Amino acid sequence: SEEDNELNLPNLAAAYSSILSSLGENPQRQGLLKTPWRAASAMQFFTKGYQETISDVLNDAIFDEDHDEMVIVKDIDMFSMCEHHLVPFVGKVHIGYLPNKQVLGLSKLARIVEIYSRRLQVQERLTKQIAVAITEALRPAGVGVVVEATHMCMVMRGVQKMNSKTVTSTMLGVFREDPKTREEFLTLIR
Amino acid sequence: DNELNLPNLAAAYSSILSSLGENPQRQGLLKTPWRAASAMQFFTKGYQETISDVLNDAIFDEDHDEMVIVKDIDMFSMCEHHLVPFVGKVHIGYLPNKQVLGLSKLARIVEIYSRRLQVQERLTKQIAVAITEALRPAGVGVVVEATHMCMVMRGVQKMNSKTVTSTMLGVFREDPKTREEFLTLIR
Amino acid sequence: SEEDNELNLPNLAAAYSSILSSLGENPQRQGLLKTPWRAASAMQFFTKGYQETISDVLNDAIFDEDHDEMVIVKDIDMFSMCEHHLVPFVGKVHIGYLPNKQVLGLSKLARIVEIYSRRLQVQERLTKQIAVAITEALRPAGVGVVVEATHMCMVMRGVQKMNSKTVTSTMLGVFREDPKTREEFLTLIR
Amino acid sequence: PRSEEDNELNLPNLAAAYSSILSSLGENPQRQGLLKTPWRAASAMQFFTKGYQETISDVLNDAIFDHDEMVIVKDIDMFSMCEHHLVPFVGKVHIGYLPNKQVLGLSKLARIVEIYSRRLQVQERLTKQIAVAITEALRPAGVGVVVEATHMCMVMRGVQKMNSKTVTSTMLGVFREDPKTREEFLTLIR
Amino acid sequence: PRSEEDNELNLPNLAAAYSSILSSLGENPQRQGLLKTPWRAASAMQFFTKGYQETISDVLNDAIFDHDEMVIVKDIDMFSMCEHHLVPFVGKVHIGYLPNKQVLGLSKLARIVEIYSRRLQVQERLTKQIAVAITEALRPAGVGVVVEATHMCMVMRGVQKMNSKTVTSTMLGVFREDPKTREEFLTLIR
Amino acid sequence: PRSEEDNELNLPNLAAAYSSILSSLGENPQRQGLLKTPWRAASAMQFFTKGYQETISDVLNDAIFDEDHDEMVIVKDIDMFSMCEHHLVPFVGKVHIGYLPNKQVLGLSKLARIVEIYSRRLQVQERLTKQIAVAITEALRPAGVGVVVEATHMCMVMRGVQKMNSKTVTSTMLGVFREDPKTREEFLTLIR
Amino acid sequence: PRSEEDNELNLPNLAAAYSSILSSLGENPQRQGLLKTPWRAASAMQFFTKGYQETISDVLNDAIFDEDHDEMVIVKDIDMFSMCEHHLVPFVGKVHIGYLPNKQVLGLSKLARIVEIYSRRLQVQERLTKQIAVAITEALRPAGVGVVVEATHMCMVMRGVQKMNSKTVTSTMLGVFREDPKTREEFLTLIR
Amino acid sequence: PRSEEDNELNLPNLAAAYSSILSSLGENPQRQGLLKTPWRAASAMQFFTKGYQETISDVLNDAIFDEDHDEMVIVKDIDMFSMCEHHLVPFVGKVHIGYLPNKQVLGLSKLARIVEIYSRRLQVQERLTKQIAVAITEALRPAGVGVVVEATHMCMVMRGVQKMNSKTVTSTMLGVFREDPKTREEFLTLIR
Amino acid sequence: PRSEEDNELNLPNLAAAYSSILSSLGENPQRQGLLKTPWRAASAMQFFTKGYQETISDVLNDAIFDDEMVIVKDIDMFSMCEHHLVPFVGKVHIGYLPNKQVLGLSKLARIVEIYSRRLQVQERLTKQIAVAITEALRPAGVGVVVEATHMCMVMRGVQKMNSKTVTSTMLGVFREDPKTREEFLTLIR
Numbered sequence A, C: 001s002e003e004d005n006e007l008n009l010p011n012l013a014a015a016y017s018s019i020l021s022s023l024g025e026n027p028q029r030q031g032l033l034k035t036p037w038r039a040a041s042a043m044q045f046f047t048k049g050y051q052e053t054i055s056d057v058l059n060d061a062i063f064d065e066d067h068d069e070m071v072i073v074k075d076i077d078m079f080s081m082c083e084h085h086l087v088p089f090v091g092k093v094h095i096g097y098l099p100n101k102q103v104l105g106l107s108k109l110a111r112i113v114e115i116y117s118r119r120l121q122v123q124e125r126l127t128k129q130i131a132v133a134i135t136e137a138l139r140p141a142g143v144g145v146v147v148e149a150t151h152m153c154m155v156m157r158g159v160q161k162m163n164s165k166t167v168t169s170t171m172l173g174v175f176r177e178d179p180k181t182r183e184e185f186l187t188l189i190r
Numbered sequence B: 001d002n003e004l005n006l007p008n009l010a011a012a013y014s015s016i017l018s019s020l021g022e023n024p025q026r027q028g029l030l031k032t033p034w035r036a037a038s039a040m041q042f043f044t045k046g047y048q049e050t051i052s053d054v055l056n057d058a059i060f061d062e063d064h065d066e067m068v069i070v071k072d073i074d075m076f077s078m079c080e081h082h083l084v085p086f087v088g089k090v091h092i093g094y095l096p097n098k099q100v101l102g103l104s105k106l107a108r109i110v111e112i113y114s115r116r117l118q119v120q121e122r123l124t125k126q127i128a129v130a131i132t133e134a135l136r137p138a139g140v141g142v143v144v145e146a147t148h149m150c151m152v153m154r155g156v157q158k159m160n161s162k163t164v165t166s167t168m169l170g171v172f173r174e175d176p177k178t179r180e181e182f183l184t185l186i187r
Numbered sequence D, E: 001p002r003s004e005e006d007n008e009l010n011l012p013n014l015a016a017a018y019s020s021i022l023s024s025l026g027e028n029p030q031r032q033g034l035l036k037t038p039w040r041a042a043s044a045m046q047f048f049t050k051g052y053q054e055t056i057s058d059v060l061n062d063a064i065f066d067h068d069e070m071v072i073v074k075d076i077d078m079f080s081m082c083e084h085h086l087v088p089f090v091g092k093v094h095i096g097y098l099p100n101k102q103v104l105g106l107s108k109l110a111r112i113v114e115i116y117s118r119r120l121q122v123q124e125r126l127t128k129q130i131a132v133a134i135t136e137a138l139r140p141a142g143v144g145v146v147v148e149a150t151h152m153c154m155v156m157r158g159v160q161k162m163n164s165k166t167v168t169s170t171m172l173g174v175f176r177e178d179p180k181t182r183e184e185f186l187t188l189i190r
Numbered sequence F, G, H: 001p002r003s004e005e006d007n008e009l010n011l012p013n014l015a016a017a018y019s020s021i022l023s024s025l026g027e028n029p030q031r032q033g034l035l036k037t038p039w040r041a042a043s044a045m046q047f048f049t050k051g052y053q054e055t056i057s058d059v060l061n062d063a064i065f066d067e068d069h070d071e072m073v074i075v076k077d078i079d080m081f082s083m084c085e086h087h088l089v090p091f092v093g094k095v096h097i098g099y100l101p102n103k104q105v106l107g108l109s110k111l112a113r114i115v116e117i118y119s120r121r122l123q124v125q126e127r128l129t130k131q132i133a134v135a136i137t138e139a140l141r142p143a144g145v146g147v148v149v150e151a152t153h154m155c156m157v158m159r160g161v162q163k164m165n166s167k168t169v170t171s172t173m174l175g176v177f178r179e180d181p182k183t184r185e186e187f188l189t190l191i192r
Numbered sequence I: 001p002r003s004e005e006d007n008e009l010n011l012p013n014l015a016a017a018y019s020s021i022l023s024s025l026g027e028n029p030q031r032q033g034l035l036k037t038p039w040r041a042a043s044a045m046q047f048f049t050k051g052y053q054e055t056i057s058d059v060l061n062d063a064i065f066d067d068e069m070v071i072v073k074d075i076d077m078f079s080m081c082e083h084h085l086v087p088f089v090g091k092v093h094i095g096y097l098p099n100k101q102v103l104g105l106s107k108l109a110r111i112v113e114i115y116s117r118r119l120q121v122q123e124r125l126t127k128q129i130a131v132a133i134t135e136a137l138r139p140a141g142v143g144v145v146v147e148a149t150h151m152c153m154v155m156r157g158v159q160k161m162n163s164k165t166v167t168s169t170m171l172g173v174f175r176e177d178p179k180t181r182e183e184f185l186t187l188i189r
């Protein structure tokens, strides 16, 4: 909740101030005076998806169109946080679905990405949660989700493989059972 | 209808300027109620058209059954939920059944439905249904790719997001080989 | 103000409902029922720059540095509204400046773009307001601002020149007086 | 300079602060995906700030060889940390210099980027420090440094301008005094 | 100037001439595919030369507003007819100008391209006419016009140089006298 | 077939018609830039329709070789320039041809020459596309032929609908290129 | 496995061999630019072959998660630097790995660490490709693994055939990646 | 096979023929720029046809390894320079080779050397494509081989039809590359 | 200069050193996949350093023919870092303004081969190409730009995957006249 955010902000700032001292830095120097608070607020914003529910995000934007054709929202910018290192992983989400007389509002597909990506995560879980949320909200014939991301933990440190990218895929309903629907989806997201 | 409704549209746009905190009397805004009203009538000019007039009897005989595609047709529509543009491209394919449509008419058909208050899904289906009813072909495939400004300039603000809708009728739905040839040739 | 927005929202919705009827549409059909309110909110968001002042936007993010080298923030996505047709014009803003004793917070250069772009505008005025705001806030040796935009009024209607783009340029202080400074700026924004 | 003994001693304090952040965000620090996170996040942050453990003399490692023509090392991948939000800023560094009978080892130019980028920083300071370090180590006729970076604090939050990039430039010696040397440098780094 | 009355009076004469061309080429004007061709070719030709029906004053439509900046409208799609062979030449027009107290409506620069390009022409004349029309309408400090076009007379026939392109340039006022203004224009139209 | 003698005899009639068009458009046929136009436009139009002067037999010129070759042959990116028969305005693009020989192999250049016979006429894309495929089929008797034509029609860009980016793609698949989807897929993959 | 003590003991022997190579090439090991070369070349060669010092278990470091996922996971564009065992000249490129988990998901970075164990050795592209796929299969027991290696061999560009654009692509498909063409096709579509 | 002794003996005859060509074109063989041309043109033509001096066995040089690899091996983007037998004008491009080894794996560079044996001759694209595939098939006895050649023929761009962008693509699929479409699809996807 | 007799006498020494290197790395130089490696590695190293055998006069081969800019750009270059004995590869772009003599186009690339096929440092290699052209033709000026990826900076050490080194040498009018140098740099893009 927003009350939880206000109550936990000083605790987060104290932890960030302690990190600055433990790294050998001077929390009292000009450039670092407001850093405990700004880092705490940024981390709250990066994890704002914990504050959201699918019902509020959908906001009744479910329409009735006699549509039994493929709908895709691709190149949705995604910014998440690795739960192992607390370092960002960023990329794109491509979503496809085959409606079953209930059609979702286009923007709501990107809002669903925001609920789960703005959390401490792993790409596999994030990919599956987006597909399951759309499946449960719309009850469509099928859903396909592809996430492509650069993990900063693999480029700025560790293995330091500058070009590496992780691609995760989740195919539910007809997107799993019918290879032709999955192939049309993968062709159209290029 | 356009001439009669132009002053009502201009009165509504002038009222919007005042309600936003702007000064409708300032030099840059004096003609805005009229220009905005004319622009909105042009963006919704598809309501003035019928398929028959647009086709203009441009249907010719072609005995050999080959796939015909008109791709990269620039499309400019209006979102019916926010009254903000959604723009992109339409790619149309069909397999004739002895009748072939005039090439330009495929783009004119896009103009009838796109120049209206719409939703991408309905727009995509209308183009495919109009071609199906006009030509009675073996099948039709329509792919619409668009940037909705309501998802980039506001709301979710996902700068690169694009919506892709597809409608496959007749052999384009029943035969995956026909649909695959269409999708390969529109790249 | 936000109070002005709440008070004027029903008047904006009434005007948008009237526009739906005047276009030949049915405001009672499912797809249009909430449109007067949604269009009103979208228009208020597109013109939220009238709710801001340079001082609040700057938020005292002016640092003292021994930096007398070129600073550029380029490819700032910009979304504005043509004041003549009430149709969007969108593109990018590239800003460069040579600090004297004060250096502005990087994000404030993009926030300055937001104060002026979220208004009913003309590209030339927008370009000049960004350069003047930076000049008055920082008193630098010079500022350069380049705005490149697609006007939907020239693409979706009127002349209908699909590829046309407007580029405006404002060069102040050393960016006007010293061609070498302006050339370095234009080379670095490519 | 920060030592490896300081790192071992401060690691538990950093881990305690990161565990506290996990709890203050509303997360479950006992869940499988978070069990080792306090330690992994602490190690990642020590690696991101390893530049405090280095000195120019150790980094140079006597790699100065006995030429008065332009030498450039461009597209050096750079990963830094914003000191205001503790969020990465990443991109590229392009360095050019005109030797004065002493040529630096090519790799040492990238190692100099590492000393200063692996710290809590601001782009302007980082750009100046690289140019000054090369100037003091080699005493060349001049040095030019261009840093281009995406600040995640401007993409994942705040203004959320997905394409925004910051470009900073420092020109010293003949790179400032002679526009022809600076022009050759900027042409060759494209 | 040519009028819709002249158009309707000359349409049967144009159609008779196109029918005669069909017979003189060895074709059968009575075959299904050619029956309406004399009329459709005649209408297309009078649309390609619709520029003779226009005047600068009507096209400007008083869209002159009351700046210290370079204004450019680039990538204006241009379609003209070669006067020597009556075959299209197509490409792009890039216009730049420095206003002197009067600023022209953005779309009018593209409308000015339409008056002169929709005629039987030579590229050099078309380029000069656009620059002269802007100069006389606005009285600016200077104007620069660059036209790049593929002549179908050089690709479909004659020399048959598939990739050949003609680039013509006209620089007036400060765009001719000040190389710095011309260089800024050429850099910004890339 | 149209002859060079027919061209000489009809040139003055074409020039008179083009001179008449100049006057009917409001132009001055006597101005310097237009003096030679009736003749130059007439010659250009005869060159654009020179395909009526040619035969498949003359164009092939016996360039049919024998071989134990049963592998795919493609000539792609053949620049094509044609004239729309409805508006007498160019349509331009590329032709991609594939075929599976049946012991007879056509000379590589002849595939582009076949494109020239039919494209240099008053046409429609669909007719042009089948004519190229049918000519190859009848000349070689191969296992199959595939023809893909991609073109920009200037009548859809410079006028009418004015859709700047629009392109027409027509496809003709005969023999094994129609019956075997695997052969057609190899062809479409290799022409990218 | 090779140890850090073995590296310290063998460093002078490697330096003596590199100093001998400098003399045998006609160079002067005493000139300023070559004085430290025997030691730096020796250290670089030990770094290029550091994969002999590693074991899969240490490299994995228990980064196997037991959070179910029955969907395709790919780590593509992993920069790869190896050494040809026949010429002792580098071959460099990228590795693209895909797998279908069977209730065990590997840490993303470990897939790149697996590439490092085998590529930092004297190798042959075919063996390298197979070792990465086998190591993942044995560590995770997944439904299947696919590995694609694309590399420029400097032995084919700087010498020998001297084909400057040549690239070698090797592929290994195990489990469902071999048995189910639909799984393999999804993998190859997603690595583009 | 043509020998280096044959080259020395025939060099004056080639130079006499090239000197005669200079005179027959209206040129002056005595002008400074043409004095050595008969000899340089003769040496260049011998180099362009040096493939007649080679045999598959010498080129392979026993570079056949018995590592039992059951996975796809590709060498793509092999620069190819050949000579059209019909006009004596170059045709240049790229060769992409794929194979599935059975019990024998060929040395990577030998696939490019096989391209050199056949391309450095007076050729026709179809024959060249087939020869490369048949040589690999006979040398290794693999499960299958796929060869794709893409080339620009200067006879179709500098003269004749003068289609500046035209490209010829030839394909040969043997063994499992013909019988299994899934193997052929993996090959064509991996050579993009 | 290095002779073919020196190559025959020194090839054995290089092979014995590579065999010793294989053993010192923990490998088995007796295993099937390494049996021919000492000889192959020795031959590859001789090929990479064949430039010490070449003289400018032999390479030129009298290809000098009897006042506008001439450029040969995108010359593929493969050299060896003298500090680590690892390749550095890229492109060389050469421009010159002839006086009365014009060199044969290929000789500019053959001059790149003389100096690049040696143990080098990019700076020296760039200068040696410009000086060789200057001394052979006595032109009004020469400009040389070398762009290279050093494998010692990507496969090891700093491991900066995208890093590139660009070195430049401008002699005669290419140094003295900035307009000549600008024409050269614009034309090599």
Ligand SMILES: Nc1nc2c(ccn2[C@@H]2O[C@H](COP(=O)(O)OP(=O)(O)OP(=O)(O)O)[C@@H](O)[C@H]2O)c(=O)[nH]1
Pocket: A082, A083, A084, A085, A121, A122, A123, A124, A153, A157, A158, A159, D036, D040, G060, G061, G063, G105, G106, G107, G108, G109, G110
């Ligand atoms: N499957 C999956 N895995 C994920 C994330 C995010 C992170 N991870 C992975 O957790 C592992 C942690 O291992 P560890 O304890 O050994 O840490 P550490 O020494 O710092 O590792 P390293 O990075 O090698 O230096 C790493 O392998 C990392 O990649 C995700 O989205 N999906």
Ligand SMILES: Nc1nc2c(ccn2[C@@H]2O[C@H](COP(=O)(O)OP(=O)(O)OP(=O)(O)O)[C@@H](O)[C@H]2O)c(=O)[nH]1
Pocket: A058, A059, A061, A103, A104, A105, A106, A107, A108, B079, B080, B081, B082, B118, B119, B120, B121, B150, B154, B155, B156, C034, C038
């Ligand atoms: N399927 C479909 N849906 C369409 C369009 C055009 C628009 N829409 C969608 O109508 C929904 C309206 O929702 P709402 O009432 O909650 O509004 P609002 O708070 O302003 O939303 P948001 O924009 O998210 O801030 C949105 O989801 C929008 O995307 C289309 O073509 N196809």
Ligand SMILES: Nc1nc2c(ccn2[C@@H]2O[C@H](COP(=O)(O)OP(=O)(O)OP(=O)(O)O)[C@@H](O)[C@H]2O)c(=O)[nH]1
Pocket: B031, B035, C082, C083, C084, C085, C121, C122, C123, C124, C153, C154, C157, C158, C159, E060, E061, E063, E103, E104, E105, E106, E107, E108, E111
């Ligand atoms: N300098 C400048 N000019 C601007 C804007 C925004 C708009 N404008 C321009 O005002 C002019 C208004 O003219 P008008 O009355 O004739 O309208 P209308 O018939 O609808 O025009 P048209 O579009 O041709 O159909 C147009 O030329 C338009 O382009 C800007 O940012 N900078």
Ligand SMILES: Nc1nc2c(ccn2[C@@H]2O[C@H](COP(=O)(O)OP(=O)(O)OP(=O)(O)O)[C@@H](O)[C@H]2O)c(=O)[nH]1
Pocket: A034, A038, C058, C059, C061, C103, C104, C105, C106, C107, C108, D082, D083, D084, D085, D121, D122, D123, D124, D153, D157, D158, D159
């Ligand atoms: N010149 C310079 N400036 C730098 C950095 C790194 C960061 N900054 C800038 O410090 C300012 C601090 O502002 P603030 O206190 O108001 O914070 P906050 O509300 O979170 O801001 P915001 O991001 O707008 O939400 C911001 O403007 C930020 O951009 C750098 O390298 N160079």
Ligand SMILES: Nc1nc2c(ccn2[C@@H]2O[C@H](COP(=O)(O)OP(=O)(O)OP(=O)(O)O)[C@@H](O)[C@H]2O)c(=O)[nH]1
Pocket: E082, E083, E084, E085, E121, E122, E123, E124, E153, E154, E157, E158, E159, F036, F040
């Ligand atoms: N400066 C200028 N020149 C222009 C145009 C348009 C056309 N032209 C040129 O008039 C010349 C007429 O010559 P001509 O009589 O010999 O014609 P013709 O034998 O058919 O020629 P060709 O095409 O070579 O076969 C041609 O050279 C043509 O290119 C333009 O915009 N600017």
Ligand SMILES: Nc1nc2c(ccn2[C@@H]2O[C@H](COP(=O)(O)OP(=O)(O)OP(=O)(O)O)[C@@H](O)[C@H]2O)c(=O)[nH]1
Pocket: B055, B056, B058, B100, B101, B102, B103, B104, B105, E036, E040, F084, F085, F086, F087, F123, F124, F125, F126, F155, F159, F160, F161
């Ligand atoms: N299938 C096919 N159709 C072709 C060509 C070439 C042209 N055409 C098409 O003939 C139709 C004629 O219609 P019409 O009489 O109404 O003309 P007109 O008012 O001038 O039309 P418009 O252009 O819309 O303004 C148009 O649809 C045009 O596109 C081709 O190759 N294949």
Ligand SMILES: Nc1nc2c(ccn2[C@@H]2O[C@H](COP(=O)(O)OP(=O)(O)OP(=O)(O)O)[C@@H](O)[C@H]2O)c(=O)[nH]1
Pocket: G084, G085, G086, G087, G123, G124, G125, G126, G155, G159, G160, G161, H060, H061, H063, H105, H106, H107, H108, H109, H110, I036, I040
């Ligand atoms: N399959 C496979 N093969 C590999 C490597 C690495 C190298 N090789 C290949 O071994 C062969 C050695 O033969 P050889 O004795 O004739 O040597 P040499 O005269 O120097 O040859 P060449 O280079 O042509 O001059 C070459 O064909 C080389 O390419 C690999 O990873 N996979």
Ligand SMILES: Nc1nc2c(ccn2[C@@H]2O[C@H](COP(=O)(O)OP(=O)(O)OP(=O)(O)O)[C@@H](O)[C@H]2O)c(=O)[nH]1
Pocket: F060, F061, F063, F105, F106, F107, F108, F109, F110, F113, H084, H085, H086, H087, H123, H124, H125, H126, H155, H159, H160, H161
């Ligand atoms: N299948 C195949 N065909 C090949 C080559 C190489 C060349 N050719 C083709 O031999 C034909 C010879 O015909 P011809 O006698 O009529 O000559 P000529 O008048 O000069 O022709 P043209 O060029 O049109 O002027 C041409 O069609 C040429 O393309 C190849 O590799 N594969």
Ligand SMILES: Nc1nc2c(ccn2[C@@H]2O[C@H](COP(=O)(O)OP(=O)(O)OP(=O)(O)O)[C@@H](O)[C@H]2O)c(=O)[nH]1
Pocket: D060, D061, D063, D065, D103, D104, D105, D106, D107, D108, G036, G040, I081, I082, I083, I084, I120, I121, I122, I123, I152, I156, I157, I158
């Ligand atoms: N100016 C110049 N310098 C060149 C080359 C080729 C190489 N070098 C540079 O010699 C230096 C040697 O340093 P060193 O002793 O410390 O070795 P080592 O610890 O292994 O280094 P490192 O690689 O950092 O790990 C490095 O800086 C290397 O880059 C060139 O062409 N021009």
Ligand SMILES: [Zn+2]
Pocket: A082, A083, A084, A085, A086, A087, A151, A153, A154
């Ligand atoms: Zn991580």
Ligand SMILES: [Zn+2]
Pocket: B079, B080, B081, B082, B083, B084, B148, B150
């Ligand atoms: Zn909307």
Ligand SMILES: [Zn+2]
Pocket: C082, C083, C084, C085, C086, C087, C151, C153
């Ligand atoms: Zn407007």
Ligand SMILES: [Zn+2]
Pocket: D082, D083, D084, D085, D086, D087, D151, D153
């Ligand atoms: Zn920050």
Ligand SMILES: [Zn+2]
Pocket: E082, E083, E084, E085, E086, E087, E151, E153
């Ligand atoms: Zn012409």
Ligand SMILES: [Zn+2]
Pocket: F084, F085, F086, F087, F088, F089, F153, F155, F156
């Ligand atoms: Zn037409």
Ligand SMILES: [Zn+2]
Pocket: G084, G085, G086, G087, G088, G089, G153, G155
């Ligand atoms: Zn090798």
